[PDB]
Amino acid sequence: ARVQPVIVEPLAAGQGKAIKAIAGYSISKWEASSDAITAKATNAMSITLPHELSSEKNKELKVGRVLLWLGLLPSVAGRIKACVAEKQAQAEAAFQVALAVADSSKEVVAAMYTDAFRGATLGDLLNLQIYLYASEAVPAKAVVVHLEVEHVRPTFDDFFTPVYR
Amino acid sequence: RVQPVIVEPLAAGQGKAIKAIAGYSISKWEASSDAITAKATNAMSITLPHELSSEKNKELKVGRVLLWLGLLPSVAGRIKACVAEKQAQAEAAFQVALAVADSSKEVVAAMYTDAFRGATLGDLLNLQIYLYASEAVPAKAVVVHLEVEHVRPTFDDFFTPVYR
Amino acid sequence: ARVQPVIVEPLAAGQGKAIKAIAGYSISKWEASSDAITAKATNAMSITLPHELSSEKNKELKVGRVLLWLGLLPSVAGRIKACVAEKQAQAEAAFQVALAVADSSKEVVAAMYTDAFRGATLGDLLNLQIYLYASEAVPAKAVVVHLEVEHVRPTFDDFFTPVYR
Amino acid sequence: KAIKAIAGYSISKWEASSDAITAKATNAMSITLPHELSSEKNKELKVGRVLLWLGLLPSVAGRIKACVAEKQAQAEAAFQVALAVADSSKEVVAAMYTDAFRGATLGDLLNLQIYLYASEAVPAKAVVVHLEVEHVRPTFDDFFTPVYR
Amino acid sequence: RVQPVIVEPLAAGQGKAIKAIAGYSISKWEASSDAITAKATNAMSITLPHELSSEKNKELKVGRVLLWLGLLPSVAGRIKACVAEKQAQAEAAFQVALAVADSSKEVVAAMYTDAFRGATLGDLLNLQIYLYASEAVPAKAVVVHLEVEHVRPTFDDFFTPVYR
Amino acid sequence: ARVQPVIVEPLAAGQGKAIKAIAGYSISKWEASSDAITAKATNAMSITLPHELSSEKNKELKVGRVLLWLGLLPSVAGRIKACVAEKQAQAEAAFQVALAVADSSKEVVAAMYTDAFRGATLGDLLNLQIYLYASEAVPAKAVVVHLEVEHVRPTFDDFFTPVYR
């Protein structure tokens, strides 16, 4: 005999529960500037490590969630899709095998790849690619990609480089 | 088992207010704009108020912030705006940006629940807002407001000492 | 481990919790017929008191909520916006400083100005204006505006005019 | 100390403008209600006490008088069945029908008529009746109309 | 029997502050002047601030008030100022006046502990201050301040509702 | 029915309760030699930091009271006023907006700016000026100004400069 009536708050952008990561982990933050693409063409673009993460310690840690949210040039126009995937030698087909995929057309331009990699070594993402694809041609450096990732906190980025003492 | 409900449509302006977290204040002000043509992105400096710009309060610890902008009702098309540090490239700011204020969306407000917490008002001095527009806009047709808050200056206290 | 599944009743128009005002107050009801407007132009239109409310008692009461819901000529066409505001000398800009604003385009053609005036004297609304604006030209007397307001109940509209006895 | 209305009752007032008026002729007219309460929601409310009293533009010679009555045929005679009668000549011009309507729906107010009788012609708008009917508080007239107009 | 003491000289500005009576605020502002010649008495309207002039707060109940004026340091001679309703005669206001602010006296401040209590800000709109001067004064050489206070507007609350 | 009769000690100069600062703070002491001024003219004169206080640690501490007591050349003659204020671009008007102001004419040639700055960063006083004004022309270096200030004690001016060991 329930009939509880709810009100629904419109939600201001940026409002949100934010989701901080499970303990012992530390989300890092870094970028990957886009290249200009031919219209409807789908270029691959490789995933370099951040400077600090190229260190030979951390290349074998353990990675959990991956969150690729795609920013844009504000006045870019067309539909745009992007996703992480295995190093395929070809085109779209990474999308047809991708676990998840971002879209410009739907409110949240983001994708979260939980379970996709937990828990790989951090260094092995070098084998991976992101993929980018757009309905329309776009100018270069206009689709920056903020993929984000966490790992067990670099336990021994604790101290100064010893030299000297 | 199923628990049927009934959505109540909700009119503009009647939503629950967000109280400031305790011990704070609010400090609204305006920041009128100019021009913006085609798909250019004009940038505006923020500008501190009357009572504010004083060395007493230039240190205060900013908390959350809000930035809703109000269009002239009859402006054509779609516009967006954001807050970020003086990027050398005007478009670039949106890319690092945490939130925009899309006009197409049902509600034109962005707020940064974090991002500015623990910050000096003085740092907020050099912190451009931006605009983008798909069309043409007659000058000062658009005027960003902004709630901010900061721990209350003792300011109120009692009066200035009578023996000035 | 929750996953409570809800049903959503479609809601018939006019259904609703209605919201009666906090005690001691009494909502009044009155009108303000619209004037014909030039297309895209934004005329001001002044707020007269209702006959009974012009009485010199009530002009100093205390006003709480204000609810301006905008009715229409059923076959009026274009986008229409309306809002109460300070007596600006100019045009749209009252909208860019208005706390709230009605729209034809969104289900609820209404706006509720709680906190906007609580608690002014009832008489001081004379300083205020509503504003009206439309994407398209409209015929006169086609956009009647039912702004509604409450106040402490007129404590001494209790009795007959004494004359005589 | 005026005679305040009992309990939950709520007085509500309105003037009714007059008309042209010739000497000796009884001049009929009809009460026609505030629009606000003329609704079907509340025409069916229970009336209690009612009284009319009528001001005059000061420069009107001669006596004038009025009353509320049922619709008539010869009209003029209605004073003879009138249960009270306001008059300029009288001490207080007010007339009070405490009893006569105390039980009525406002539905019958619609077919009641007020009458005017100047002795000699008086210019239009020089007389203005005011009614002071009284009735129960509307149940609806408290909570807002639902948002979804 | 005698209870010897020892007066402590007290430096400018170090006196005990007067707290506002509880639940209030403070609302300082300026009111710059002009001219004043010979022994004429120029009159100035008070002028309500930025945030103030809004129908929400035009009713608020004013409490006490303070009015200290600051001379340009090097002005000649002696000047006085007061607050009263628009007397038809400019000199006359001092005569009904409750307090002046003499310059010759050690401390140049007048305050009206009562007199305005229970008053609307709106009434305060029509309420001239005055000046008098024994000499000549270059324009805007003198600038009355004024503490006032009024019950706090809820104003702070939380933010404007996000759905503007 | 009180009528307690008091005696009043004349007070020798220098006698006084002295006022030491609230704990954790440490008053510092430093100077600012005056420049010659045109009669009745009011020059600004900037506030440099003391040598030790220019250190990049302390420039962000917390400042409480400020006490500007003005010494003089003993045989200087005229009326003299001085005050700290905001960096105005003009003349006297800093006095008409100054919270407090010293005077030669009244026993205590001093001013204490409690509440004026509590609690700014120590470094931000660089934006401030003192102002000086005199009824009569005065010779240079004749109106030295001993403004004094305290701050949280420089917590880590504790140790020797490490070099070496």
PDB file of C-alpha atoms in Angstrom, chain E residues 10-163:
ATOM      1  CA  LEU E  10      45.277  55.607  26.828  1.00  0.00           C
ATOM      2  CA  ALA E  11      46.447  55.692  23.244  1.00  0.00           C
ATOM      3  CA  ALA E  12      44.256  56.302  20.243  1.00  0.00           C
ATOM      4  CA  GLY E  13      42.282  53.308  19.065  1.00  0.00           C
ATOM      5  CA  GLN E  14      42.940  50.934  21.927  1.00  0.00           C
ATOM      6  CA  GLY E  15      39.675  51.333  23.802  1.00  0.00           C
ATOM      7  CA  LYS E  16      37.201  48.532  24.404  1.00  0.00           C
ATOM      8  CA  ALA E  17      35.104  47.805  21.349  1.00  0.00           C
ATOM      9  CA  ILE E  18      31.344  48.034  21.494  1.00  0.00           C
ATOM     10  CA  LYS E  19      29.883  44.732  20.386  1.00  0.00           C
ATOM     11  CA  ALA E  20      26.634  44.834  18.555  1.00  0.00           C
ATOM     12  CA  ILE E  21      23.788  43.622  20.652  1.00  0.00           C
ATOM     13  CA  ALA E  22      23.203  40.007  19.680  1.00  0.00           C
ATOM     14  CA  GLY E  23      21.608  38.840  16.464  1.00  0.00           C
ATOM     15  CA  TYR E  24      22.572  41.934  14.519  1.00  0.00           C
ATOM     16  CA  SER E  25      25.168  42.981  12.018  1.00  0.00           C
ATOM     17  CA  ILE E  26      26.954  46.171  11.041  1.00  0.00           C
ATOM     18  CA  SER E  27      26.770  48.021   7.746  1.00  0.00           C
ATOM     19  CA  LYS E  28      29.398  50.686   7.255  1.00  0.00           C
ATOM     20  CA  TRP E  29      29.499  53.017   4.304  1.00  0.00           C
ATOM     21  CA  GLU E  30      30.783  56.389   3.208  1.00  0.00           C
ATOM     22  CA  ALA E  31      29.162  59.643   2.230  1.00  0.00           C
ATOM     23  CA  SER E  32      31.594  62.106   0.692  1.00  0.00           C
ATOM     24  CA  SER E  33      30.819  65.821   0.687  1.00  0.00           C
ATOM     25  CA  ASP E  34      31.319  68.952  -1.366  1.00  0.00           C
ATOM     26  CA  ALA E  35      32.235  72.628  -0.985  1.00  0.00           C
ATOM     27  CA  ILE E  36      30.884  74.261   2.184  1.00  0.00           C
ATOM     28  CA  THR E  37      31.947  77.888   2.362  1.00  0.00           C
ATOM     29  CA  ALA E  38      32.142  80.611   5.015  1.00  0.00           C
ATOM     30  CA  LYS E  39      29.589  79.596   7.619  1.00  0.00           C
ATOM     31  CA  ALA E  40      27.097  77.999   5.293  1.00  0.00           C
ATOM     32  CA  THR E  41      25.536  74.676   6.215  1.00  0.00           C
ATOM     33  CA  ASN E  42      25.542  72.312   3.248  1.00  0.00           C
ATOM     34  CA  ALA E  43      23.246  69.315   3.559  1.00  0.00           C
ATOM     35  CA  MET E  44      23.787  65.813   2.253  1.00  0.00           C
ATOM     36  CA  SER E  45      21.362  63.027   1.634  1.00  0.00           C
ATOM     37  CA  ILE E  46      22.402  59.686   2.991  1.00  0.00           C
ATOM     38  CA  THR E  47      22.712  57.061   0.299  1.00  0.00           C
ATOM     39  CA  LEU E  48      22.076  53.364   0.717  1.00  0.00           C
ATOM     40  CA  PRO E  49      24.760  50.858  -0.385  1.00  0.00           C
ATOM     41  CA  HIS E  50      25.205  48.330  -3.130  1.00  0.00           C
ATOM     42  CA  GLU E  51      23.719  45.211  -1.566  1.00  0.00           C
ATOM     43  CA  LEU E  52      21.233  47.164   0.474  1.00  0.00           C
ATOM     44  CA  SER E  53      18.767  48.811  -1.851  1.00  0.00           C
ATOM     45  CA  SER E  54      16.525  45.789  -2.317  1.00  0.00           C
ATOM     46  CA  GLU E  55      12.949  45.213  -1.325  1.00  0.00           C
ATOM     47  CA  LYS E  56      13.834  42.251   0.815  1.00  0.00           C
ATOM     48  CA  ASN E  57      15.685  44.368   3.312  1.00  0.00           C
ATOM     49  CA  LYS E  58      14.057  47.778   2.985  1.00  0.00           C
ATOM     50  CA  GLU E  59      12.259  46.527   5.941  1.00  0.00           C
ATOM     51  CA  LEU E  60      14.780  45.789   8.606  1.00  0.00           C
ATOM     52  CA  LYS E  61      14.657  47.173  12.096  1.00  0.00           C
ATOM     53  CA  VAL E  62      17.496  49.616  12.686  1.00  0.00           C
ATOM     54  CA  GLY E  63      19.021  49.602  16.132  1.00  0.00           C
ATOM     55  CA  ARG E  64      21.702  51.980  17.391  1.00  0.00           C
ATOM     56  CA  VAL E  65      23.800  54.057  15.039  1.00  0.00           C
ATOM     57  CA  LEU E  66      27.185  55.735  15.004  1.00  0.00           C
ATOM     58  CA  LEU E  67      28.434  58.641  13.010  1.00  0.00           C
ATOM     59  CA  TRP E  68      32.016  59.641  13.254  1.00  0.00           C
ATOM     60  CA  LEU E  69      33.424  61.924  10.646  1.00  0.00           C
ATOM     61  CA  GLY E  70      37.014  62.188   9.561  1.00  0.00           C
ATOM     62  CA  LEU E  71      38.536  65.511   8.692  1.00  0.00           C
ATOM     63  CA  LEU E  72      41.261  65.916   6.142  1.00  0.00           C
ATOM     64  CA  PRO E  73      44.085  66.251   8.638  1.00  0.00           C
ATOM     65  CA  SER E  74      45.109  69.752   7.750  1.00  0.00           C
ATOM     66  CA  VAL E  75      41.755  71.528   7.526  1.00  0.00           C
ATOM     67  CA  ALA E  76      41.603  74.866   9.276  1.00  0.00           C
ATOM     68  CA  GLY E  77      39.518  75.549  12.333  1.00  0.00           C
ATOM     69  CA  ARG E  78      36.412  73.798  13.516  1.00  0.00           C
ATOM     70  CA  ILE E  79      33.481  71.916  12.003  1.00  0.00           C
ATOM     71  CA  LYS E  80      30.313  70.183  13.181  1.00  0.00           C
ATOM     72  CA  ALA E  81      27.776  67.737  11.814  1.00  0.00           C
ATOM     73  CA  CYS E  82      24.509  66.096  12.787  1.00  0.00           C
ATOM     74  CA  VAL E  83      21.613  63.948  11.722  1.00  0.00           C
ATOM     75  CA  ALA E  84      18.016  65.104  11.515  1.00  0.00           C
ATOM     76  CA  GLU E  85      14.923  65.026   9.322  1.00  0.00           C
ATOM     77  CA  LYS E  86      14.661  67.498   6.488  1.00  0.00           C
ATOM     78  CA  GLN E  87      14.184  70.723   8.385  1.00  0.00           C
ATOM     79  CA  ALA E  88      13.087  73.521   6.072  1.00  0.00           C
ATOM     80  CA  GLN E  89      15.774  75.698   7.596  1.00  0.00           C
ATOM     81  CA  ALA E  90      19.281  74.356   7.414  1.00  0.00           C
ATOM     82  CA  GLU E  91      20.515  75.767  10.715  1.00  0.00           C
ATOM     83  CA  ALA E  92      17.435  74.640  12.572  1.00  0.00           C
ATOM     84  CA  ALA E  93      18.352  70.982  12.610  1.00  0.00           C
ATOM     85  CA  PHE E  94      21.031  71.506  15.227  1.00  0.00           C
ATOM     86  CA  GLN E  95      18.479  72.918  17.558  1.00  0.00           C
ATOM     87  CA  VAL E  96      16.260  69.860  17.651  1.00  0.00           C
ATOM     88  CA  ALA E  97      19.372  67.731  17.427  1.00  0.00           C
ATOM     89  CA  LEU E  98      20.322  65.243  20.104  1.00  0.00           C
ATOM     90  CA  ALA E  99      24.037  65.152  19.352  1.00  0.00           C
ATOM     91  CA  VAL E 100      26.666  66.960  17.355  1.00  0.00           C
ATOM     92  CA  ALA E 101      30.148  65.970  16.431  1.00  0.00           C
ATOM     93  CA  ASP E 102      32.350  68.805  17.583  1.00  0.00           C
ATOM     94  CA  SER E 103      35.877  68.854  16.219  1.00  0.00           C
ATOM     95  CA  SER E 104      37.311  70.838  19.120  1.00  0.00           C
ATOM     96  CA  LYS E 105      36.454  68.063  21.508  1.00  0.00           C
ATOM     97  CA  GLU E 106      39.029  65.326  22.083  1.00  0.00           C
ATOM     98  CA  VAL E 107      36.925  62.771  20.229  1.00  0.00           C
ATOM     99  CA  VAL E 108      34.951  63.415  17.051  1.00  0.00           C
ATOM    100  CA  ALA E 109      32.120  60.957  17.293  1.00  0.00           C
ATOM    101  CA  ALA E 110      28.444  61.155  17.952  1.00  0.00           C
ATOM    102  CA  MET E 111      26.094  58.265  18.292  1.00  0.00           C
ATOM    103  CA  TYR E 112      22.428  57.925  18.890  1.00  0.00           C
ATOM    104  CA  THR E 113      21.887  55.117  21.343  1.00  0.00           C
ATOM    105  CA  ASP E 114      18.154  55.528  20.999  1.00  0.00           C
ATOM    106  CA  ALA E 115      16.232  57.840  18.708  1.00  0.00           C
ATOM    107  CA  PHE E 116      16.401  55.495  15.753  1.00  0.00           C
ATOM    108  CA  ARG E 117      15.586  52.264  17.489  1.00  0.00           C
ATOM    109  CA  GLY E 118      12.681  50.375  15.999  1.00  0.00           C
ATOM    110  CA  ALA E 119      12.984  52.254  12.726  1.00  0.00           C
ATOM    111  CA  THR E 120      12.652  51.111   9.133  1.00  0.00           C
ATOM    112  CA  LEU E 121      15.627  51.548   6.806  1.00  0.00           C
ATOM    113  CA  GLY E 122      13.121  52.938   4.391  1.00  0.00           C
ATOM    114  CA  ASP E 123      12.379  55.824   6.709  1.00  0.00           C
ATOM    115  CA  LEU E 124      16.092  56.346   6.960  1.00  0.00           C
ATOM    116  CA  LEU E 125      16.060  57.183   3.259  1.00  0.00           C
ATOM    117  CA  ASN E 126      14.671  60.629   3.897  1.00  0.00           C
ATOM    118  CA  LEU E 127      16.991  61.710   6.642  1.00  0.00           C
ATOM    119  CA  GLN E 128      19.599  64.348   5.880  1.00  0.00           C
ATOM    120  CA  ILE E 129      22.885  64.685   7.645  1.00  0.00           C
ATOM    121  CA  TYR E 130      24.330  68.163   7.840  1.00  0.00           C
ATOM    122  CA  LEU E 131      27.548  70.082   8.055  1.00  0.00           C
ATOM    123  CA  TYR E 132      28.671  73.390   9.429  1.00  0.00           C
ATOM    124  CA  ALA E 133      32.021  75.017   9.067  1.00  0.00           C
ATOM    125  CA  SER E 134      33.623  78.138  10.385  1.00  0.00           C
ATOM    126  CA  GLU E 135      35.914  78.590   7.411  1.00  0.00           C
ATOM    127  CA  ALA E 136      36.417  77.349   3.869  1.00  0.00           C
ATOM    128  CA  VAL E 137      36.653  73.729   2.807  1.00  0.00           C
ATOM    129  CA  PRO E 138      37.937  72.350  -0.502  1.00  0.00           C
ATOM    130  CA  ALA E 139      35.515  69.840  -1.982  1.00  0.00           C
ATOM    131  CA  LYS E 140      35.426  66.312  -0.588  1.00  0.00           C
ATOM    132  CA  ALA E 141      37.852  67.196   2.156  1.00  0.00           C
ATOM    133  CA  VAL E 142      35.483  65.654   4.640  1.00  0.00           C
ATOM    134  CA  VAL E 143      33.796  62.270   4.620  1.00  0.00           C
ATOM    135  CA  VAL E 144      31.266  61.048   7.126  1.00  0.00           C
ATOM    136  CA  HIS E 145      31.359  57.360   7.869  1.00  0.00           C
ATOM    137  CA  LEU E 146      28.532  55.647   9.613  1.00  0.00           C
ATOM    138  CA  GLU E 147      28.138  52.394  11.442  1.00  0.00           C
ATOM    139  CA  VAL E 148      24.538  51.368  11.571  1.00  0.00           C
ATOM    140  CA  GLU E 149      23.075  48.038  12.287  1.00  0.00           C
ATOM    141  CA  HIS E 150      20.018  46.097  11.571  1.00  0.00           C
ATOM    142  CA  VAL E 151      18.874  42.593  12.184  1.00  0.00           C
ATOM    143  CA  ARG E 152      20.700  40.323   9.803  1.00  0.00           C
ATOM    144  CA  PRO E 153      18.924  39.479   6.611  1.00  0.00           C
ATOM    145  CA  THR E 154      18.668  35.714   6.202  1.00  0.00           C
ATOM    146  CA  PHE E 155      20.610  36.600   3.032  1.00  0.00           C
ATOM    147  CA  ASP E 156      23.555  34.378   3.868  1.00  0.00           C
ATOM    148  CA  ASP E 157      21.381  31.249   4.191  1.00  0.00           C
ATOM    149  CA  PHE E 158      22.821  28.962   1.602  1.00  0.00           C
ATOM    150  CA  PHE E 159      23.260  29.741  -2.048  1.00  0.00           C
ATOM    151  CA  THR E 160      20.808  30.985  -4.559  1.00  0.00           C
ATOM    152  CA  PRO E 161      18.884  27.928  -5.685  1.00  0.00           C
ATOM    153  CA  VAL E 162      20.902  26.288  -8.401  1.00  0.00           C
ATOM    154  CA  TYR E 163      17.976  26.167 -10.751  1.00  0.00           C
TER     155      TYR E 163
END
